[PDB]
Amino acid sequence: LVTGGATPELEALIAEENALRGGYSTPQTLANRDRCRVAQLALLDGPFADLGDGGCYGDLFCKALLCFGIYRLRDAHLSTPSQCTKRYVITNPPYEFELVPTDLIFCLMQFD
């Protein structure tokens, strides 16, 4: 998840050579690019934005194929305005969790 390439073959090569030798994009080599990446999506603009004001964490995994947390502003749970842009992390919120339009969401994105 973190190092981006911790597979048995890569471990064998760096144990032999301590370096990366470049190679040609043969179709079995090129198939190894298909791996998920971490990303943040904006909830105030996009195909999720009607959930973004709809206010519930209805997970929609049937599209583009995985959300795992929220990045919520520290002053979003109160009615008074504030200039603070700091955000804290909520990991695995309940299915019924009350979301707000100024949320970002942590997700794993497919390769395309």
């Binding site: 144990a15 470049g22 190679g23 994009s25 080599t29 520290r74």
Partner: protein
């Protein structure tokens, strides 16, 4: 004292299952009164023996030939990381020399010393010999936070054992502490989940088993998609409040070309040895 008390807080946590595992400390310095008092507070699950990891008599006294694993803690704050890593390398060659088949878990400070570690003939990371490299995982956490801010925070919170602290005041803390109550757990899944699609499987246990489903997995495939998902003896990694909660994933009742662009594996982008005088 700080290393043992931190270790015992995570190891003997009540969010784990019935952990009957006895903990045996081997250290060449006699414990001070504070550390002797910490061992008296754990009288039925911790034992201490004075001795050296470099002596095969002391490894025999501690019954290494029947230990489930050996854990080697590093001094993170040492004056010279190379002398600390070279000392922990010595420990592992001593333990493996006395018994080739014991599982070893070790902290390493510097990544180049981790490459020396896997040149030991009986070190086998395919059967659970684990080198927790602090430079690799630190700079990796930071790197993944460049794609999504705060990811380094939740990853660090998923491995710390912590109960759900309750706070009544509407604060950023009440929603943060709910998230902090989660850890990552492994479990096997097969009954009623063999041959199903990975998304469907995630939906079912998220929606009705109320646990945040398999982030991965067969092999170690993170979020696989609609294809390449048919295995019967596969394992999953789940996010849940405690180890008692994830157990319901078992016995599911059904009731309710011309230029080199990449490395030789294709795992990383590559270009050529660019030169320092050209990137400056």
């Amino acid at each position: 004292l700080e290393s043992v008390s931190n270790f015992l807080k995570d190891f003997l946590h009540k969010d784990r299952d019935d952990v009957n595992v006895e903990i045996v400390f081997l250290h060449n310095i006699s414990p001070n009164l504070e550390l002797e008092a910490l061992f008296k507070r754990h009288f039925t699950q911790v034992e201490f023996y004075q001795g050296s990891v470099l002596n095969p008599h002391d490894l025999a006294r501690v019954k290494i030939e029947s230990a489930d694993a050996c854990l080697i803690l590093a001094n993170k704050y040492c004056a010279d990381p190379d002398a600390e890593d070279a000392s922990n390398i010595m420990r592992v060659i001593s333990i493996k020399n006395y018994h080739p088949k014991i599982r070893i878990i070790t902290q390493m400070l510097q990544y180049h010393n981790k490459a020396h570690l896997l040149n030991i003939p009986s070190w086998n990371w395919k059967e659970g010999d684990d080198a927790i490299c602090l430079a690799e995982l630190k700079l990796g956490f930071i790197a993944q936070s460049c794609l999504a801010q705060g990811l380094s925070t939740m990853l660090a919170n998923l491995f710390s054992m912590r109960s759900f602290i309750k706070i009544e005041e509407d604060t950023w803390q009440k929603y943060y502490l709910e998230g902090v109550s989660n850890e990552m757990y492994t479990e096997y899944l097969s009954s009623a989940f063999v041959g199903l699609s990975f998304p469907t499987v995630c939906e079912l246990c998220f929606v009705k088993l109320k646990l945040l489903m398999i982030a991965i997995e067969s092999r170690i495939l993170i979020n696989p998609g609609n294809h390449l998902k048919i295995q019967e003896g596969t394992l999953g990694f789940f996010i849940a409040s405690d180890a008692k909660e994830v157990k319901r994933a078992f016995f599911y009742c059904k009731a309710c070309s011309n230029v080199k662009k990449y490395d030789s594996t294709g795992m990383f982008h590559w270009c050529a040895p660019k030169e320092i005088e050209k990137v400056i």
